[PDB]
Amino acid sequence: AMYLAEALAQRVEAQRRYSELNQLLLDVAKVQEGDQPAENPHEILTELEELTTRINDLVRRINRTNSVTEFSEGMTLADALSVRDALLKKRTLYSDLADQLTSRQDRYSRSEIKYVATMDAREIRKKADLAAKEYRQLDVDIQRLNWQTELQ
Amino acid sequence: AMYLAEALAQRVEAQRRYSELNQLLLDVAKVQEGDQPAENPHEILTELEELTTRINDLVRRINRTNSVTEFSEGMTLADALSVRDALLKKRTLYSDLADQLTSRQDRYSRSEIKYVATMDAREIRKKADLAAKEYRQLDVDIQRLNWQTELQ
Amino acid sequence: NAMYLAEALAQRVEAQRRYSELNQLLLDVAKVQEGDQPAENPHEILTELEELTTRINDLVRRINRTNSVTEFSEGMTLADALSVRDALLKKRTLYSDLADQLTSRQDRYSRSEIKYVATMDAREIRKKADLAAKEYRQLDVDIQRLNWQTELQ
Amino acid sequence: AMYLAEALAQRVEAQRRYSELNQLLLDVAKVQEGDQPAENPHEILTELEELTTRINDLVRRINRTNSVTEFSEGMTLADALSVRDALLKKRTLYSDLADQLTSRQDRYSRSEIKYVATMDAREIRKKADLAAKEYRQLDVDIQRLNWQTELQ
Amino acid sequence: AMYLAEALAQRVEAQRRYSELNQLLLDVAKVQEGDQPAENPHEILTELEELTTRINDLVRRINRTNSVTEFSEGMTLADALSVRDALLKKRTLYSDLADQLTSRQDRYSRSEIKYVATMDAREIRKKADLAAKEYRQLDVDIQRLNWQTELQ
Amino acid sequence: NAMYLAEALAQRVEAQRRYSELNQLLLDVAKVQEGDQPAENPHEILTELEELTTRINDLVRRINRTNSVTEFSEGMTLADALSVRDALLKKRTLYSDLADQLTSRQDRYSRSEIKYVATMDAREIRKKADLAAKEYRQLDVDIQRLNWQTELQ
């Protein structure tokens, strides 16, 4: 048992190993006629099935602690995690809108007519710049809590 | 307030609308000199920012209820949801492995190095067929609970 | 304002991102339709950037200082540990590439009628990688922890 | 033991050898039936693992001395090194901006939407020309110090 | 007046500026009807002609001092500079030869005319590895001398 | 054997040509049909080359020395004149490119309906080139002459 932050790291590593072992397995699922396989399939397969039951553990555990650890007044960490996702979705939105009012937009390859922004880019960028500050604050606050919380 | 199943539907619809309004906004964000907005950007933008705060509500709520309703002896619905994911990941695994063992590459010379199943496909398919039955049982059991549970 | 070294690393990252983004904007906006003005004011955007720069360069300098002054373990500064971590990655990458070159370059390999042979036990290489990987992750995590209980000098 | 400048050179050579041995190893990692290793893999592998622990030494040493040698009033050499990087980043910035203001793209009708400089390139080039002089001074001052400093 | 090392740096910068001004000039040499010179051609041209007479000075000076400064027993720095070039030419030679002996290209039938090394690559690599050590020593010794020598 | 500096310049050129050529041969011959021997013996060819190298490097060193020691004119070594000649070429190239960029980039230029304008009198530039060209040729010839009445140190 350990801190929730440590757990998030382990999950990541495991799913990486899984993805990698998963790859190996397939390559090694067919072999040069004459001989044997670089590693042993049946062995690699079990190595993987073991990661699986191991990963699935961290997830449920991580899940339970997220939804039980208090992040702030009336907000579980699970609640804050999803607000963070939403803030990103939101930042992406304004950023795309803005540079669509200016960037790939203010190209006029050859025309005898002008292009026009239907909204104020100056304003949109502000709205994005804001949603960005908020994301980063929340993210950092969460990373902090992650590192001072015991995995249930 | 309503049943958790109804909530899952609403989320889906909203994110679809969002994606769609998101699209519209961008198309409508430019123009040339003398046309008009075919729909009003600033209006569509607010329509969207309203979906956002709404979606984010259903999510937190859906989240909260998943992690609080009993699915079975010592298993929250949040716990069962992630097992279901794992079972899919797992079924995909065996299925790919299997049809990779029954994958041919026809060669033209008997004197050309053949590859051969390093494993018994019959066995793998069983393992997949099993992981598939399990997924479907869990999924159905979850769909049932979803429909007899009040969204917190 | 002063804070933890972890927070500082985050701020650097954000700033260089903004910089890269502002840098982009500036260029797009450096020419404009004959009639109008810039969607955003160049000279303004330029100063916004030159301000990030002197900011960023501050965090770096500070981050640098504290890395080379906080101790990570018996006779190892954090700067020392940071570079060991880099080396461990370099190392893990090495064995991983070598291994799947002993196995991968095998199956999508043949269409001819001679066998392909490996000049080393892939089983062994993978161990060596698997090891270098565990070590990376330990060090990384240990560093992330220290990062979060250290005041930026 | 030697001067910091000499150390910088050795690092560079080693990483070059490494990259080169790394290459060789891979080429030499396979074969068909009755060949031979152009050189011996297991040998080449150790040659490499030895460079690694060697390089990693110079780095740790170079690092230490950079962050301990005084470059000027209140500035370590490590501090100056990063200013130099920043000055380059900066010079690049103005140079790109400038020749993007003098980059020219020409139309067919005089009735075609022209973009035109949004800034006095004359000014930008000055700012670049300046950031360039500063880079070179710092760089030279650093190269100097590098050659009259004992590697810790 | 300064150290020969500083002079080498200045040459490099100048030829870079030259190349860059040279570029600008050409871009700015034309236009359609009612434009303007991003910068002033005739001005830029003189800026350049001034670098030229400046560069040509450093070269003549650098040249003189190289051929007058003693590098070692019976060797001017000019002599050492050309040995260093030769050592590089030489290192390149053996490196190319070697990885041309370990360059591998594989056939289909075992009944297909194989080429095989015509030399012990092991040996060639040694000869390269040696020519490489020698280059680096000389180079470093030269960089050193460069930094403790007054430009004539 | 000792000779005139001109002869030496010729020998350098020939040698580097042979070198380049031998260098080529070596590589082609570095692998051979499984059955046979090399059309020419590698190890032999390799030494032939290593011998040119120590030869060449001699002429260079010697040529170098004599260039920086024979006088070309009042206060100008031949090494000094050699580099002025390089500069004059660099210079001639400059004006020539600028000029035909003021004129050439004009005719194969248009398919549209706006005129192209030059920001400088091509007439003037060509003069400046034409001049730098005369100077190059004078210097070059003067050097070629000196080269032929000078003993290689």
CSV table of C-alpha atoms in Angstrom, one decimal, chain C residues 16 19 23 26-35 38 42-43 46-47 49-50 53 56-57 60-62 64-65 68 75-77 79-81 83-84 87 90-91 94-95 97-98 101-103 105-106 112 114-121 125 128, chain D residues 15 18 22 25-33 37 41-42 45 48-49 52 55-56 59-61 63-64 67 74-76 78-80 82-83 86 89-90 93-94 96-97 100-105 107 112-120 124 127:
chain,number,residue,atom,x,y,z
C,16,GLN,CA,6.7,27.6,-23.0
C,19,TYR,CA,5.1,31.1,-25.8
C,23,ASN,CA,4.9,32.9,-31.2
C,26,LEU,CA,2.4,36.7,-34.0
C,27,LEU,CA,3.6,35.3,-37.3
C,28,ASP,CA,0.1,34.7,-38.7
C,29,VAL,CA,-0.9,38.2,-37.8
C,30,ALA,CA,2.4,39.7,-39.1
C,31,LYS,CA,0.5,40.4,-42.4
C,32,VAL,CA,-3.1,41.4,-42.7
C,33,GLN,CA,-5.8,42.1,-45.3
C,34,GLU,CA,-5.0,45.4,-47.0
C,35,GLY,CA,-8.1,47.0,-45.6
C,38,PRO,CA,-4.9,42.7,-37.0
C,42,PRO,CA,1.1,42.5,-33.1
C,43,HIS,CA,3.1,45.0,-31.0
C,46,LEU,CA,5.2,40.8,-29.1
C,47,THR,CA,5.5,42.4,-25.7
C,49,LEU,CA,5.9,37.3,-25.4
C,50,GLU,CA,9.0,39.2,-24.4
C,53,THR,CA,10.5,35.1,-22.0
C,56,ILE,CA,10.4,31.7,-18.1
C,57,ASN,CA,14.1,32.4,-17.9
C,60,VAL,CA,14.6,28.0,-15.3
C,61,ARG,CA,17.4,29.7,-13.5
C,62,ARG,CA,15.6,29.1,-10.1
C,64,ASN,CA,18.3,25.0,-12.0
C,65,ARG,CA,19.7,26.4,-8.8
C,68,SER,CA,21.7,21.5,-8.0
C,75,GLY,CA,26.0,12.2,-2.0
C,76,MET,CA,23.5,12.9,-4.8
C,77,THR,CA,22.0,16.3,-5.6
C,79,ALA,CA,20.5,17.5,-10.5
C,80,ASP,CA,22.5,14.3,-10.3
C,81,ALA,CA,19.4,12.2,-10.0
C,83,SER,CA,20.5,13.0,-15.2
C,84,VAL,CA,20.7,9.4,-13.9
C,87,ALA,CA,20.4,7.8,-18.6
C,90,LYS,CA,18.3,6.1,-22.8
C,91,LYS,CA,19.3,2.7,-21.5
C,94,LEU,CA,18.5,0.7,-25.9
C,95,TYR,CA,17.6,-2.8,-24.7
C,97,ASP,CA,15.0,-1.7,-29.5
C,98,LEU,CA,17.7,-4.4,-29.5
C,101,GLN,CA,15.0,-6.2,-33.4
C,102,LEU,CA,15.9,-9.8,-32.4
C,103,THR,CA,12.3,-10.9,-32.6
C,105,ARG,CA,12.6,-8.2,-37.5
C,106,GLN,CA,11.9,-11.9,-37.6
C,112,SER,CA,12.4,-16.0,-49.0
C,114,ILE,CA,16.6,-19.2,-45.9
C,115,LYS,CA,16.1,-18.9,-42.1
C,116,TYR,CA,16.9,-15.7,-40.1
C,117,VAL,CA,19.1,-16.1,-37.1
C,118,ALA,CA,19.6,-13.9,-34.0
C,119,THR,CA,23.0,-13.5,-32.6
C,120,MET,CA,21.9,-13.1,-29.0
C,121,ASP,CA,19.3,-14.5,-26.5
C,125,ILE,CA,17.9,-8.7,-23.5
C,128,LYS,CA,18.0,-6.3,-19.1
D,15,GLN,CA,27.7,10.0,-27.5
D,18,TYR,CA,27.6,5.4,-28.6
D,22,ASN,CA,24.3,1.4,-31.1
D,25,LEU,CA,24.9,-3.7,-32.8
D,26,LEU,CA,21.4,-3.6,-34.5
D,27,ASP,CA,22.8,-4.4,-38.0
D,28,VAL,CA,24.8,-7.2,-36.5
D,29,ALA,CA,21.9,-8.5,-34.3
D,30,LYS,CA,20.6,-10.8,-37.1
D,31,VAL,CA,21.7,-12.9,-40.0
D,32,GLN,CA,20.5,-15.9,-42.1
D,33,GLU,CA,21.8,-19.5,-41.5
D,37,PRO,CA,28.9,-11.6,-36.9
D,41,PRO,CA,27.5,-8.6,-30.6
D,42,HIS,CA,28.1,-9.5,-26.9
D,45,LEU,CA,27.2,-4.6,-26.3
D,48,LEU,CA,28.6,0.3,-25.2
D,49,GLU,CA,27.5,-0.3,-21.6
D,52,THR,CA,27.3,4.6,-20.9
D,55,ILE,CA,29.4,9.3,-20.4
D,56,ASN,CA,27.1,9.5,-17.4
D,59,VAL,CA,27.7,14.6,-17.4
D,60,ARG,CA,27.4,14.4,-13.6
D,61,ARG,CA,30.9,16.0,-13.4
D,63,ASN,CA,26.9,19.4,-14.4
D,64,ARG,CA,28.5,19.8,-11.0
D,67,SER,CA,26.7,24.9,-11.2
D,74,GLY,CA,26.0,36.5,-8.9
D,75,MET,CA,26.0,34.2,-11.9
D,76,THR,CA,27.0,30.5,-12.0
D,78,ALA,CA,25.0,27.0,-15.2
D,79,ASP,CA,23.0,30.3,-15.1
D,80,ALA,CA,25.0,31.7,-18.0
D,82,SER,CA,20.8,29.0,-19.9
D,83,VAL,CA,20.8,32.7,-20.6
D,86,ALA,CA,17.4,31.9,-24.1
D,89,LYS,CA,15.7,31.2,-28.7
D,90,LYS,CA,15.2,35.0,-28.8
D,93,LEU,CA,12.3,34.6,-32.8
D,94,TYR,CA,13.1,38.0,-34.3
D,96,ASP,CA,11.8,34.4,-38.2
D,97,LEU,CA,9.4,37.3,-37.6
D,100,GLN,CA,8.1,36.7,-42.4
D,101,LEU,CA,7.5,40.5,-42.8
D,102,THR,CA,9.7,40.6,-45.9
D,103,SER,CA,8.6,37.3,-47.3
D,104,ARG,CA,6.7,38.3,-50.3
D,105,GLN,CA,3.9,36.6,-52.2
D,107,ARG,CA,-1.1,38.4,-57.0
D,112,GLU,CA,-6.9,41.0,-55.1
D,113,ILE,CA,-6.8,41.2,-51.2
D,114,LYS,CA,-3.2,42.2,-50.4
D,115,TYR,CA,-1.7,41.6,-47.0
D,116,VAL,CA,1.0,44.1,-46.1
D,117,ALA,CA,3.5,44.4,-43.2
D,118,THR,CA,1.8,44.8,-39.9
D,119,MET,CA,5.1,46.0,-38.4
D,120,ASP,CA,8.3,47.8,-39.3
D,124,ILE,CA,12.5,43.8,-35.9
D,127,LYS,CA,16.0,43.6,-32.3
